[PDB]
C-alpha cells in the first residue's frame, strides 16, 4: 500500500488504465476522508481533511472509474 500526497499524482493514478476501482472511507472521529484507488500492484490512498472540497474531488475523478463508499461493517 502507498500513500499519495499530491492531488495531481492522485488524478493521474485514477486516470491510469489498470485502476480497477476506488472507494471513499470516512473517519468522522478524526475528521478525515480517505480516497483509495486499487491498481494492479498497489493500493493508493490519499488522505484529506473532511471538507466540501474533498467531496467535490469525486467529481474531478474520472467518470468511468467505479467509486464506492465504504460501509460501516465489512460483511463477508
Amino acid at each position: 500500500p502507498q500513500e499519495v500526497s499530491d492531488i495531481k499524482k492522485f488524478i493521474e493514478i485514477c486516470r491510469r488504465k489498470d485502476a480497477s476501482s476506488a472507494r471513499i472511507k470516512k473517519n468522522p472521529k478524526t475528521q478525515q476522508i480517505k480516497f483509495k484507488v486499487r491498481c494492479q500492484r498497489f493500493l493508493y490512498t490519499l488522505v484529506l481533511k473532511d471538507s466540501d472540497k474533498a467531496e467535490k474531488l469525486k467529481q474531478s475523478l474520472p467518470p468511468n472509474l467505479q467509486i464506492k463508499d465504504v460501509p460501516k461493517r465489512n460483511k463477508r
Binding site: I7, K8, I11, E12, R15, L48, K53, L57, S60
Partner: protein, 49 residues
Amino acid sequence: RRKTKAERNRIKRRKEEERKRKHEEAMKRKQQQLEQAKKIAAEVEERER
C-alpha cells in the same frame, strides 16, 4: 567552546520545530491543490491529449 546541555536542548527543540513547520507547510500545499483540483484535472487531460 564546549556547548552546554541547555544549548544542546535548544538545538534539539529547533530541529523539532523545523520538522513540524515542514509538515504543516506540506499539508497546506495539499489543501491548496485540493481547492485547485478542477484546473489540475484539466491540465492532466490536456497533457494526455
